[PDB]
Design an enzyme around this catalytic site. Structure first.
Site, PDB file in Angstrom:
ATOM      1  CG  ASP A 151      34.863  57.780  67.329  1.00 13.48           C
ATOM      2  OD1 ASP A 151      34.507  58.421  66.304  1.00 13.48           O
ATOM      3  OD2 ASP A 151      36.031  57.755  67.742  1.00 13.48           O
ATOM      4  NE  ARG A 155      37.978  58.800  63.658  1.00 13.96           N
ATOM      5  CZ  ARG A 155      36.868  59.442  63.252  1.00 13.96           C
ATOM      6  NH1 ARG A 155      36.678  59.764  61.982  1.00 13.96           N
ATOM      7  NH2 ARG A 155      35.943  59.803  64.142  1.00 13.96           N
ATOM      8  CG  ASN A 156      37.209  54.393  65.273  1.00 12.08           C
ATOM      9  OD1 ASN A 156      38.392  54.269  65.565  1.00 12.08           O
ATOM     10  ND2 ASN A 156      36.520  55.506  65.534  1.00 12.08           N
ATOM     11  CG  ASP A 169      39.350  51.427  69.340  1.00 14.60           C
ATOM     12  OD1 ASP A 169      39.963  50.369  69.661  1.00 14.60           O
ATOM     13  OD2 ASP A 169      39.922  52.484  69.020  1.00 14.60           O
TER      14      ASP A 169
HETATM   15  C1  LIG Z   1      47.742  42.352  62.164  1.00 11.02           C
HETATM   16  C2  LIG Z   1      49.005  42.901  61.520  1.00 11.02           C
HETATM   17  C3  LIG Z   1      49.151  44.411  61.543  1.00 11.02           C
HETATM   18  O1  LIG Z   1      50.242  44.955  61.625  1.00 11.02           O
HETATM   19  N1  LIG Z   1      48.014  45.117  61.344  1.00 11.02           N
HETATM   20  C4  LIG Z   1      47.880  46.531  61.289  1.00 11.02           C
HETATM   21  C5  LIG Z   1      48.837  47.384  60.741  1.00 11.02           C
HETATM   22  C6  LIG Z   1      48.586  48.745  60.664  1.00 11.02           C
HETATM   23 CL1  LIG Z   1      49.801  49.824  60.032  1.00 11.02          CL
HETATM   24  C7  LIG Z   1      47.407  49.299  61.124  1.00 11.02           C
HETATM   25  C8  LIG Z   1      46.431  48.454  61.626  1.00 11.02           C
HETATM   26 CL2  LIG Z   1      44.922  49.139  62.139  1.00 11.02          CL
HETATM   27  C9  LIG Z   1      46.657  47.083  61.705  1.00 11.02           C
HETATM   28  N2  LIG Z   1      45.678  46.249  62.295  1.00 11.02           N
HETATM   29  C10 LIG Z   1      45.303  46.221  63.604  1.00 11.02           C
HETATM   30  N3  LIG Z   1      44.434  45.247  63.937  1.00 11.02           N
HETATM   31  C11 LIG Z   1      44.010  45.224  65.201  1.00 11.02           C
HETATM   32  C12 LIG Z   1      44.415  46.168  66.115  1.00 11.02           C
HETATM   33  O2  LIG Z   1      43.910  46.030  67.387  1.00 11.02           O
HETATM   34  C13 LIG Z   1      43.882  47.172  68.268  1.00 11.02           C
HETATM   35  C14 LIG Z   1      42.798  46.983  69.304  1.00 11.02           C
HETATM   36  C15 LIG Z   1      41.446  47.101  68.976  1.00 11.02           C
HETATM   37 CL3  LIG Z   1      41.014  47.496  67.348  1.00 11.02          CL
HETATM   38  C16 LIG Z   1      40.434  46.844  69.899  1.00 11.02           C
HETATM   39  O3  LIG Z   1      39.136  47.000  69.508  1.00 11.02           O
HETATM   40  C17 LIG Z   1      38.168  46.036  69.910  1.00 11.02           C
HETATM   41  C18 LIG Z   1      40.773  46.517  71.196  1.00 11.02           C
HETATM   42  C19 LIG Z   1      42.108  46.428  71.559  1.00 11.02           C
HETATM   43  O4  LIG Z   1      42.472  46.084  72.824  1.00 11.02           O
HETATM   44  C20 LIG Z   1      41.460  45.943  73.816  1.00 11.02           C
HETATM   45  C21 LIG Z   1      43.108  46.657  70.607  1.00 11.02           C
HETATM   46 CL4  LIG Z   1      44.776  46.404  71.011  1.00 11.02          CL
HETATM   47  C22 LIG Z   1      45.313  47.143  65.701  1.00 11.02           C
HETATM   48  N4  LIG Z   1      45.777  47.167  64.449  1.00 11.02           N
END
Ligand SMILES: *CCC(=O)Nc1cc(Cl)cc(Cl)c1Nc1ncc(OCc2c(Cl)c(OC)cc(OC)c2Cl)cn1
Length: 272
Positions: A151, A155-156, A169
């Site tokens: 995917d 967006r990812n 992801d």
């Molecule tokens: C870092 C500060 C913040 O608020 N960042 C933020 C704010 C908004 Cl509105 C939107 C986004 Cl996308 C973000 N940044 C962010 N960074 C990382 C995130 O992690 C989620 C996540 C991912 Cl991407 C992942 O992929 C390998 C695995 C896991 O868990 C296994 C998670 Cl939790 C989300 N948002």
């Protein structure tokens, strides 16, 4: 009833949960402050994201989050992916802790930097190509760890405070899918390459929607007849040419992630 992994376990009392970042059916992600994620300077705070289950969640949901955690451990670290930082497994709910990218996803990062009308925006050509190069490096890494994304889209891809791209992801959209995925449910590294071509188009439209207008039903017929997206405004021929190679019908005629890295490298090298 989970084992304690000495390589990854982080103290539950040093993670201060904060504002929710998103909620699925049976799980969520919250921003958090973590103290001592750098073992060297152990009092330092950093902002991380934490994935966990909601109370409304089955043993299956727990199995999926464990699988994502374990897969992230095995794949290992890279500059251009969202990295695993720690877990909390003992005496309380499962927390999986990852890097938190300050500037959100790449589509929103691009769309918010759209300049008014015909004017120049803050995103130069070399910055755009650099976004693409970094994504390709992340994908080349995941590919070397036998990870097929399935995917890949803007967006990812997330963006750090320092404008580093990080693929999201990877350890768990018809307009992003290769034909063999669309029609035969087959996903390979080469089908990810097709998606990367769509992502390239997204970058160079500053976060545009693919196959603009074209109803989601005419797509398959368009592709079967040899049609593809047109060159976006101001996109140089060289980069359009790469997009088009990623969208060859035959998987084996698309470039590899290694060739995309090398092509984008040649472009960045040629820009002074
Ligand atoms: C870092 C500060 C913040 O608020 N960042 C933020 C704010 C908004 Cl509105 C939107 C986004 Cl996308 C973000 N940044 C962010 N960074 C990382 C995130 O992690 C989620 C996540 C991912 Cl991407 C992942 O992929 C390998 C695995 C896991 O868990 C296994 C998670 Cl939790 C989300 N948002």
């Amino acid at each position: 009833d989970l084992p304690l992994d000495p390589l990854w376990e982080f103290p539950r009392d040093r993670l201060v949960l904060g504002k929710p970042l998103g909620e699925g059916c049976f799980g969520q992600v919250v921003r958090a402050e973590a103290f001592g994620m750098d073992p060297a300077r152990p009092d330092q705070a950093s902002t991380v994201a934490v994935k966990m289950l909601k109370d409304n969640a089955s043993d299956k949901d727990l199995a999926d989050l464990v699988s994502e955690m374990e897969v992230m451990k095995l794949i290992g670290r890279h500059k251009n992916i969202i990295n695993l930082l720690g877990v909390c497994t003992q005496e309380g709910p499962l927390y999986v802790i990852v890097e938190c990218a300050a500037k959100g996803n790449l589509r929103e990062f691009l769309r918010a930097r759209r300049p008014p009308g015909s004017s120049e925006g803050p995103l130069s050509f070399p910055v755009l190509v650099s976004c693409a190069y970094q994504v390709a490096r992340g994908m080349q890494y995941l590919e070397s760890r036998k990870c097929i994304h399935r995917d890949l889209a803007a967006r990812n891809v997330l963006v750090t405070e320092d404008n580093v791209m990080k693929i999201a992801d990877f350890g768990l959209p018809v307009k992003w899918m290769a034909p063999e995925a669309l029609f035969d449910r087959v996903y390979t590294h080469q089908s990810d390459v097709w998606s990367f071509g769509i992502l390239l188009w997204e970058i160079f439209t500053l976060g545009g929607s693919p196959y603009p207008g074209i109803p989601v039903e005419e797509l398959f017929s368009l592709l079967r007849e040899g049609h593809r997206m047109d060159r976006p405004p101001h996109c140089p021929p060289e980069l359009y040419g790469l997009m088009r190679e990623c969208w060859h019908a035959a998987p084996s005629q698309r470039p590899t992630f290694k060739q995309l890295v090398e092509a984008l490298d040649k472009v960045l090298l040629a820009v002074s």
